[PDB]
Amino acid sequence: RRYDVFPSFRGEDVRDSFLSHLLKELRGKAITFIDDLSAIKESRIAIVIFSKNYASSTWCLNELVEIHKCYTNLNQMVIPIFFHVDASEVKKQTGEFGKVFEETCKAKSEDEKQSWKQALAAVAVMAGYDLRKWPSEAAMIEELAEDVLRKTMT
């Protein structure tokens, strides 16, 4: 309830580009969001932006697990975005996305690797926004913002 939207993303991939356009569009519709774990359960909608290096951040991966928990236990709405990554690669941790993931997992416990793999497989099959299926970033973000606005009614 405190926030409409919790956005989860790798800042190095999207902060100054794709995400700047999305947040501007959300602001124009008076959709609130937190500014960059505790805040996730305080948010009605999680927007997960999967990009090439999402999997290089344990911060992002741990956010995803929490988002998964909020989806399961608090009826958090979750919207995946695929930003130059293959959705099945995210879902199955294969391809470039997988290799970054595996690289990241080397220094990490097998249980949180499992928890990560599960949250990725669960969020990656959710209905969302795959940039290859839209005519532009601007068109996709426009539909996503109106989607998010409808979701604040509920």
> Dihedral angle at the C-alpha atoms of 123, 15, 113, 44, nearest 10 degrees?
-40
Question: Are 49 and 21 in contact, with CB atoms under 8 Å apart?
Answer: no
Structural element, H or E, at residue 7: strand 3-8
Calculate the alpha carbon distances from 137 to 57, 120, 121 in Å. 24, 23, 24
Of 60, 84, 61, nearest in space to 9 by CA: 60
Set 63, 96, 112, 142: catalytic member: 63
**In 18-149, beta strands by DSSP E:** 43-50, 77-82, 129-130
Which class for 18: exposed (0-12), middle (13-18), buried (19 or more C-beta within 10 A)?
buried
**Two structure tokens written together for 1:** 């309830």
Distance CA 96, CA 104 (A): 12
For the chain, domain boundaries: 1-154
Distance CA 116, CA 124 (A): 12
Distance CA 43, CA 10 (A): 19
Residue 8 β-bridge partners: 48
1-154 is a CATH 3.40.50.300 domain: no
Please give the annotated binding residues, written as ranges.
10-15
Of 114, 1, 99, nearest in space to 56 by CA: 99
Instruction: Identify the DSSP state of 33.
Output: B
**Catalytic residue list contains 66:** no
Alpha-carbon 153 to chain mean position = 21
List, in order, residues 6 or more apart from 152 with CB less than 8 Å away: 4, 31, 44, 45
Q: What is the resolution of this structure in A?
A: 2.2
Block residue for tokens 């601007």: 138
Structural element, H or E, at residue 8: strand 3-8
Of 84, 94, 76, 81, nearest in space to 39 by CA: 76
Residue 130 β-bridge partners: 82
Please give the annotated binding residues for NAD(+), written as ranges.
10-15
List, in order, residues 6 or more apart from 53 with CB less than 8 Å away: 10, 12, 13, 100
